[PDB]
Design a protein around this nucleic acid. Structure first.
Ligand SMILES: [Ca+2]
Ligand SMILES: [Ca+2]
Ligand SMILES: [Ca+2]
Ligand SMILES: [Ca+2]
Ligand SMILES: [Ca+2]
Ligand SMILES: [Ca+2]
Ligand SMILES: [Ca+2]
Ligand SMILES: [Ca+2]
Ligand SMILES: [Cl-]
Lengths: 329, 329, 329, 328, 329
RNA sequence: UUUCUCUUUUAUCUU
RNA sequence: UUUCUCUUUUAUCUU
RNA sequence: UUUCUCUUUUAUCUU
RNA sequence: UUUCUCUUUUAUCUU
């Protein structure tokens, strides 16, 4: 309506990459409409993955603002949550290496910093009505990457400081604000900027595990562990400003839970002049006051998650909220 | 008609008999003569849960603060024995209120009193694999004490906490709801006293019978083990009857579901607690609500299938208006 | 005139520049673009305090969550030295939010952002015994890091938290309020950044410089010791300038008083926390309030005598209406 | 609407020629109105370029340092075997002491407003040879995490500059022209807002002392030298300007280099600089969107000839966008 | 609103994005500047098809006249290899237009140009036996040539038809539709050029790479074999992106269905052909439809479930009217 | 995401 | 390339 | 513990 | 198999 005409082309595209379904959004948009207009590279990451769930085991999936990695998972005994004895393994978006090299010290070779725009996820059951069982629970945690300070009895004695994931503890309880339906109904949900503005984040070098090498989980406070594995295949290149989507998928004993898992990521990077990437860059979109306030509203308005069913009805549900709040203004 | 109830008095009746998924501030409080400062804690649990075949799983919704329910499974067609031990499943943030040591429960709050205690089981299995039933009855479980002597030097007499009325779980009460598993169930408990008196927070309790106490001395039929003092524990016993749920899963039956639990509790906050910030005066006496509460409770069925969880609030309002009608004559 | 501000936008301006002894829900939140779930924590300290004669007592109102202020006394006519260490005085319920171990701060909440930071000193001594003065200035104390090498095997390079700008406490800033002790004082701090960005909760910090770190390596002029990890600690550093208060008590002077401290802080709650129950969406952007906030702040005096603590809200409203007047022309 | 006095000054310090007696202005017009001290750093460096060499000058958001210079054989770029040495702005010590732990003694934090650079050839017309090439790099100061086998075993975390690998090649978006023609270029805030960065203590080298260049990922090294003459006091949010003066064999390339820098620092009450401090200018939406627009519009760099016709390029853009938006 | 389109211009948009099961004369033609004599050929295929378990069957909707689709199956979880060959499934009456010898295609018609290319998959299996998924993306497959030398006497240089962009089938494109098998799917392709230029009929083509040509010389990743020149063949390559459909059938899964394909094609008839009798002038330029066509195409999702095949025409009309609205402002 | 009344029942802005 | 009525007789757009 | 308007701004009860 | 308008848009019958 008179709302969809106030937005700039960029402003609109932005809002779609953010809440629109993967199929509808054929155009990632020139990026984020805000004060920043420097050279960037918009990359819409998309993972499609046929996954089958282990029976008699609850599998936890974490979607975090980590570049080049779609999600992190780990399976635990049914009815339980992660423990110190738990470790999450990352699943890379296509071409993670082509972006962040193959050695924990060559992440900032292609790009120096970044900032997330959208970060969606969906689960589409593919089991027949004679085999499905279990539930899909979803909530979001405000996990941020900080640091911890502690002394070390070396010679001479020294004080350490390393990266720690703060608020990870939230994954050990299903917060009151959550989605939770039968497995068969699938689920669809997005995440948004947990900051007043879209500030860029630095690319992080050498990060492979958290707690890192030579550090006890005890000294970090983190409830469980994060392992990206062989530096040559994956790794932790940074941590964005998006709350982390948590997903508990309960699979009963003798239940066949097969589904497709999808993941979106509209990320804006700062290309290095040397990168064979740079030639695809352009300038960040101009500020679009409207789109920005719409984003915030839509975001806070939308439900935790929705069933897979209404994934398409999503874009519409959104376009509704916009005209509704832009009408009362 | 429902305009004879104070704002809170009404809210109260809702927190009580209806699952207020609706995000009201969680309850106002109890419309009783007491109007001192309290904190209305709205506890809510969402637990995905798969039931093992050939087992009759027992769940207890007890008035133990911080713990949503306790369970244990016994072979099909059987009930708990001395050889049985129930393990508690805490509501989110248990430690955030009761600490991590059996002697730091009274740190945050000093006493409490329950207002509502609801529970629902929503099947998540398919229609070809499920089988079995859900049976429900309620037990007048109170928390007393046992007095016995010990041959020490010098010989002395002991006294410890013992749960009376537990023997009620060893059989399916006559007043009960029993129906096919797939149909789920919703049920709630109520104040088993003429008034809403406050109970003290109990320090040191982690197991019943207590460690170093031989079972049967107490006379309890089975055991209650909350586990690590740093993860869970028994902080008190409310004046609510305990809800018993027997879910018998036959052989080769894939019965999964989602369990939800609600608990409106008025706690007396301690000034040194941050939690105290959210304290308000308890609602003023609302003679009408207190008389309705009683009437509604006595009316409602032991439990109902999951489906009628919605029609719940409505079913209540009609019982009220129907009661307020007879009051005019 | 003051009707151009959203309900919260106004509330915000009050929590900010006025001591809201009034029992509003403690603040609404910040009227910034951010609208994610937060918990408005209204911290308030009431500390009776007697000042030792012949000593110039220094108090620091720092943006360290959970700690109202830090103090230490130096001989009259002098300032802190390397030989000085400041001990924190926590707001009530510090542990109730940050635990009892330097690695359990991020348990309850993950990040935060201050909104208000006020402090008042109300003399309680008689008019025949008091003597001395209260001087006040504000320091742009930020929390950076220091990089230095260590002769270990193998030799390595360290990096630890160091407080920059502390040197500002060693002298009475030119922009300052200074007046007789008996006249008391009220003053508040404000966001030392163009926006309200969130800061991470910091794990492990108990002292600065950190244990095992020689003072001066950091370059700090004195030390910060929070003490037992089980009683206090340093959980983060807000983007507020620190308030410095020098209360010089001459020889034989009986100077006693009551100190009050207020702090509106928006924290990002963790779903597993009970505290999360009281979370709400941050207030929507209120362009006007954000522009007023800035204007009011720049206007107000460094500080004012205790007496004008009341006329505070009024003094503010007039500054606003006076600013909104010039906006019409 | 129109610009404020400060909002206009802000746009001049930003892209305005320094021969215009440019006013530092009151600073940056944004939401922030806190006490700050405006410093207009200017360096004039007479310099001769080694023939058969390709000298690399880097303009980085390092306070008190005008630029970092290193040289490599003609036709090549910096390598692991390279180290850049900083040339300080006047009175570096008067601001950040003489110890690697005396930086935060005068000011606690800062934020850049402008960062320009100019090269004015002084060579005659037959003696000179070579070319000047410019491109900008999004170099940011991050951190690296690696383990160390000490007793007991530990994990080490330190500063590491990311995006330096961009200096090892000539960015597609670049200015390239004959040496003699000189050059002028400027950088802008690489962030949506002008946030404050803290002052950094103890930084003298990167990789730091006791760290191999291999542990950092950094393609080469950064050395400020004697903690009593220079050092790294912080890293601002401005893209780093890269200038490659390619001098061939037998080429006499002499020239002057100027470096501008409008910085807003948060003064320490105890510092002498505090008396000079005022409040940051009130937010000026117009200027903040002009700055952003002018920046994106301007070319990477221009020959030193158009250093005066610079201000007029800007005034033009200012009203050419204040025109496509003034109609409706 | 939809009255700004010429009769044909509208018809055109329907033949294009909607399955016109409705028996209109099959399309009017293309509302482009061209108005010479053409014959609107409405190709439609109805193919019953059962998918083998443990195989990931691949289907290609290519702009090859007379052939509805090409398929081949690869082991589950895998894609085509050099060892793969796709076999074409012709629309009815292939020979009735292109003869029975690779050198009699240009007999009936000389050139052509596609207008629509739609495809739908409607599951026919029960809800207890099906399993698996349907994934869809589109490839910019064009038909180029490869130049290489041959050691003959005298030695010479060759040149033959090679399909470029086929490598796109070896992976699931990011812009894709993926959902449970049972949900079916509908999708259509569009002109991958700025205009509707005519393509020549190609004589002699039966296989790619051509007989006597070693695979890989061409650089194609797999092979295309139309078979007997008297039953099928490759008569040309339209300027439409090719539609890729991966139907993964897990082990023991009974996945059957019905596939439908539509193709509006404008051919230039030859006077000696009887077919020429049904030729008419191409529709006159309809600037509006040509601009809508483009807009509608860009909007629609990669694909949609079979169910929304009906709501298709409607979904389109709304996109149009919505576009024509913004054109007034 | 839909429609108002009614009393709610808090909550500030103003005399 | 010319002029309208008439019923044609299909054909969509709209309720 | 005092006086109303005003818009607040949430919040249920009712069609 | 249902209801008309509207312009369609072809198509003959008639001057
Ligand atoms: Ca922790
Ligand atoms: Ca009593
Ligand atoms: Ca007994
Ligand atoms: Ca910011
Ligand atoms: Ca110092
Ligand atoms: Ca590198
Ligand atoms: Ca053409
Ligand atoms: Ca190839
Ligand atoms: Cl796959």
């Amino acid at each position: 309506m008179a709302a969809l005409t106030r937005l700039s082309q960029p402003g609109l595209a932005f809002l779609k990459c953010a809440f629109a379904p993967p199929d509808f959004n054929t155009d990632p948009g020139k990026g984020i409409p805000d004060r920043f207009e420097g050279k960037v590279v918009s990359r819409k990451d998309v993972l499609n993955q046929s996954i089958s769930f282990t029976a008699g085991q609850d599998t936890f999936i974490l979607i975090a603002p980590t570049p080049g990695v779609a999600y992190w998972s780990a399976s635990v005994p049914a009815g339980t949550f992660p423990t110190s004895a738990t470790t999450f393994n990352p699943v890379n978006y296509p071409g993670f290496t082509s972006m962040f090299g193959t050695t924990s010290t060559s992440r900032s070779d292609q790009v120096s910093s970044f900032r997330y725009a959208s970060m969606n996820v969906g689960i589409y059951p593919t089991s027949n009505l004679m085999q499905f069982a279990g539930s899909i629970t979803v909530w979001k945690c405000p996990v941020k990457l900080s640091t911890v300070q502690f002394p070390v009895a070396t010679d001479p004695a020294t004080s350490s400081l390393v990266h720690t994931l703060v608020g990870l503890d939230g994954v050990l309880a299903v917060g009151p604000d959550n989605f939770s339906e039968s497995f068969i109904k699938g689920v669809f949900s997005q995440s948004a900027c947990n900051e007043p503005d879209f500030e860029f984040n630095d690319i992080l070098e050498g990060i492979q595990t958290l707690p890192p090498a030579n550090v006890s989980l005890g000294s970090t406070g983190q409830p469980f562990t994060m392992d990206s594995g062989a530096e040559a295949t994956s790794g932790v290149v940074g941590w964005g400003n998006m709350d982390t989507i948590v997903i508990r998928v309960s699979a009963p004993e003798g239940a066949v839970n097969s589904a497709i898992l999808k993941a979106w990521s509209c990320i804006e990077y700062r290309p290095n002049p040397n990168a064979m990437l740079y030639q695809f860059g352009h300038d960040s979109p101009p500020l679009d006051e409207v789109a920005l306030q719409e984003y915030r509203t839509v975001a806070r308005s939308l439900p935790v998650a929705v069933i897979a069913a209404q994934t398409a009805s999503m874009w519409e549900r959104v376009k509704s909220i916009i005209k509704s709040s832009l009408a009362a203004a």
